[PDB]
Design an enzyme around this catalytic site. Sequence first.
Site, mmCIF file in Angstrom:
data_model
loop_
_atom_site.group_PDB
_atom_site.id
_atom_site.type_symbol
_atom_site.label_atom_id
_atom_site.label_comp_id
_atom_site.label_asym_id
_atom_site.label_seq_id
_atom_site.Cartn_x
_atom_site.Cartn_y
_atom_site.Cartn_z
ATOM 1 N N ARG A 99 0.848 -1.195 0.000
ATOM 2 C CA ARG A 99 0.000 0.000 0.000
ATOM 3 C C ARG A 99 0.887 1.249 0.000
ATOM 4 O O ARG A 99 1.603 1.512 0.970
ATOM 5 C CB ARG A 99 -1.005 0.023 1.172
ATOM 6 C CG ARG A 99 -1.867 1.297 1.183
ATOM 7 C CD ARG A 99 -3.110 1.209 2.059
ATOM 8 N NE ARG A 99 -2.807 1.184 3.497
ATOM 9 C CZ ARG A 99 -3.737 1.244 4.453
ATOM 10 N NH1 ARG A 99 -5.015 1.338 4.122
ATOM 11 N NH2 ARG A 99 -3.402 1.228 5.733
ATOM 12 N N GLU B 278 -12.762 4.864 0.028
ATOM 13 C CA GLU B 278 -12.740 5.356 1.392
ATOM 14 C C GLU B 278 -12.885 6.874 1.400
ATOM 15 O O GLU B 278 -12.608 7.523 2.401
ATOM 16 C CB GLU B 278 -11.457 4.928 2.115
ATOM 17 C CG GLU B 278 -10.163 5.528 1.549
ATOM 18 C CD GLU B 278 -8.930 4.975 2.223
ATOM 19 O OE1 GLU B 278 -7.849 4.967 1.597
ATOM 20 O OE2 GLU B 278 -9.035 4.544 3.390
ATOM 21 N N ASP C 233 -11.816 5.786 7.773
ATOM 22 C CA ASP C 233 -11.364 6.810 6.826
ATOM 23 C C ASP C 233 -12.566 7.358 6.080
ATOM 24 O O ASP C 233 -12.727 8.569 5.946
ATOM 25 C CB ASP C 233 -10.365 6.240 5.819
ATOM 26 C CG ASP C 233 -8.977 6.908 5.896
ATOM 27 O OD1 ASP C 233 -8.843 8.057 6.385
ATOM 28 O OD2 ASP C 233 -8.017 6.263 5.427
ATOM 29 N N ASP D 27 -5.504 2.070 12.682
ATOM 30 C CA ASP D 27 -4.452 2.880 12.085
ATOM 31 C C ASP D 27 -4.801 4.369 12.194
ATOM 32 O O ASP D 27 -5.700 4.743 12.940
ATOM 33 C CB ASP D 27 -4.180 2.449 10.639
ATOM 34 C CG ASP D 27 -5.359 2.687 9.704
ATOM 35 O OD1 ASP D 27 -6.393 3.239 10.139
ATOM 36 O OD2 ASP D 27 -5.233 2.334 8.506
HETATM 37 O O1 52F Z 1 -11.609 1.738 9.475
HETATM 38 C C1 52F Z 1 -10.759 2.026 8.594
HETATM 39 O O2 52F Z 1 -10.986 2.639 7.522
HETATM 40 C C2 52F Z 1 -9.263 1.554 8.822
HETATM 41 C C3 52F Z 1 -8.889 0.263 8.871
HETATM 42 C C4 52F Z 1 -7.643 -0.269 9.475
HETATM 43 N N1 52F Z 1 -6.581 -0.535 8.775
HETATM 44 C C5 52F Z 1 -5.424 -1.041 9.431
HETATM 45 C C6 52F Z 1 -4.254 -1.317 8.682
HETATM 46 C C7 52F Z 1 -3.116 -1.812 9.301
HETATM 47 C C8 52F Z 1 -3.100 -2.048 10.682
HETATM 48 C C9 52F Z 1 -4.221 -1.785 11.443
HETATM 49 C C10 52F Z 1 -5.381 -1.279 10.824
HETATM 50 N N2 52F Z 1 -6.525 -1.006 11.575
HETATM 51 C C11 52F Z 1 -7.697 -0.490 10.967
HETATM 52 O O3 52F Z 1 -8.645 -0.278 11.711
HETATM 53 MG MG MG Z 2 -7.813 4.317 5.047
#
Ligand code: 52F
Ligand code: MG
Length: 712
Positions: A324, A419, A447, A618
């Site tokens: 990514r 997103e 996001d 994240d």
């Molecule tokens: O809710 C969202 O759009 C985000 C999603 C998401 N992606 C991750 C990627 C890598 C590590 C942890 C992660 N945690 C997360 O909630």
């Molecule tokens: Mg995102």
Amino acid sequence: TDRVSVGNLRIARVLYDFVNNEALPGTDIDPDSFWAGVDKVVADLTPQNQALLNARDELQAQIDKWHRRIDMDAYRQFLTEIGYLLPEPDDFTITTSGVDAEITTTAGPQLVVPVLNARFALNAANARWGSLYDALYGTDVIPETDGAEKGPTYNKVRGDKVIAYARKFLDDSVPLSSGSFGDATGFTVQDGQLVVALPDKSTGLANPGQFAGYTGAAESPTSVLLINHGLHIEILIDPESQVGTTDRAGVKDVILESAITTIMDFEDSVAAVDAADKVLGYRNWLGLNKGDLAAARVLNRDRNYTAPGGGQFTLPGRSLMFVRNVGHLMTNDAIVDTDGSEVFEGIMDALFTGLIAIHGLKASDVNGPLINSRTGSIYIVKPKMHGPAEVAFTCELFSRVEDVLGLPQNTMKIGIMDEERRTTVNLKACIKAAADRVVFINTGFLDRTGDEIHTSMEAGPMVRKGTMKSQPWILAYEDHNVDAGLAAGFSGRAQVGKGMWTMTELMADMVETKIAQPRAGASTAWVPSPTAATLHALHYHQVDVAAVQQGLAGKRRATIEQLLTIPLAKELAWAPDEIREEVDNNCQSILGYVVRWVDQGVGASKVPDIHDVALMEDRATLRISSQLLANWLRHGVITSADVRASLERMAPLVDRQNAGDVAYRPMAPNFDDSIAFLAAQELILSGAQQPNGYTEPILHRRRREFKARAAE
Ligand SMILES: O=C(O)CCc1nc2ccccc2[nH]c1=O
Ligand SMILES: [Mg+2]
Ligand SMILES: [Mg+2]
Ligand SMILES: [Mg+2]
Ligand SMILES: [Mg+2]
Ligand SMILES: [Mg+2]
Ligand SMILES: [Mg+2]
Ligand SMILES: [Mg+2]
Ligand SMILES: [Mg+2]
């Protein structure tokens, strides 16, 4: 000045040396031609990149003003006039070719992992196969009821529950002609068929085609390889093991094909704010593609079996890797131009991760063993795009990078993250813009909800964060994503993905509820860990995604009006204690994540929430929380006193939740002395002014401020 001049570029030495000494050799790319190509691509594409970001700002100002001055017809007429909502293109089928079977064919879990963490990256790549016994025993999927709790040593009562759970799983997934796996006595391979010894008789599978292979002699196999819905299941046989001795057929473990693919992430799960950080990421990405990445520990080899009809075959021991890249917004000073202007980071990622990925298409002493793509593709997830012209730009970027790398056109494939709202409502056109490169689309919560809040920031106060998950706009967004993918022929061609389960320790709830995603026709969805990948794999044995997709195809389940239904809170729908709870919730999310980001450069980890539930979110968690608080502030739901008081209440809570970490620097009681605390405050107070609510400009600046102070 520690930079290398190349045309109009001034490249940080650490990056320049990394590329020359590590990335380039073994690719047959002429180094001077590469670097000239970097300079030319950056010069050529920078104006359009900037033009696209300007257009985001232009559209958003118009939307802010429109709201400042409820009727849906006028609203979409407005969105159409300003070129935000575009007409739906004619129906079409994607033409993407040369895609690996893991993507076109297999439905299963998808892991996302911070590329800057080598051990995690290694574990994720190895997570293509995982122990069901370890996943059941180690988590709450087996309740720690009386007598069945896990202590310092093996609890046989608990293990016996683990075994029974798995037996039931095998009965469900690979049913015998008669009887249950729970009555198994042994396994043999007779006439290229699997025969299971029962007490009173013997039996084969109801569908002998589910028998896929074995290890050891057909007489007394050391393991039995089965297949269901495209996914392998391996019954390990060893009556001399700790649990094998206890088992009626001497079964040691059940191993599931789990993380079929993995996204190695340079974006929201990592903290990389300069050239030294980017090089740590690129080097790990390099090690993964060479296959020699080693930590503290190494990548797994492929797995050897005997086919039912005899003869050997080999199965991949590792997840097929995506990478990514960062999106179109941010610059990074890893490269600056003559004027000292930082270069677009997304442009740089395409050039550098693209170069590095060539190693994953090869296998020698120079490029390490182990191949990532059998069919010659490089798989890049492109996040945070807004609408079809931004997709087209990514196409042009990849095409020019391919030209620089000497790669065939369309080698670089695109995973389109849906997103952002302007991508959602123009999704079909976004897919069409990448019709010959696209290998996935997917949805999320954080996001996308972050963009939802920012876009309609001026409309009114928004419902609470928890409420967003069930809002009409987001349920239509989920279905519309599937509809568009299926209508463009994704089934059998490209992944249709859904979001992350963030509650890392709530595995029972994940197993109970995450089944909704493949039931929704998603061929993949995101998991936070190898353990969660193994458990989520159960769902794909329980649900026939291919069949679900065939039954959904051609349906139109969302309307543009549903998609555009802004999540405005009803006229005073909260008690004071509910408001207080939501502020504390959000301030805690921001502080808990930010302190680790700014102080230790950690962009993903198990962060205890306000209720002490461990979440692995994240940077999108920051975008939603800060935007929600900025919105409540904007519309007088809360005061600036409320915000500051919450941050000061939650800060020592965060400090406490971080006991057990030796490198941790407490925020309380001297709040305004902590760069992390100030970052968190800034994210909220300046939230409404950030481009599309994005948190990177502030976070990057603060982490850089921290690095400079730590070196002073
Ligand atoms: O809710 C969202 O759009 C985000 C999603 C998401 N992606 C991750 C990627 C890598 C590590 C942890 C992660 N945690 C997360 O909630
Ligand atoms: Mg995102
Ligand atoms: Mg063998
Ligand atoms: Mg290699
Ligand atoms: Mg859903
Ligand atoms: Mg469509
Ligand atoms: Mg079935
Ligand atoms: Mg499928
Ligand atoms: Mg603004």
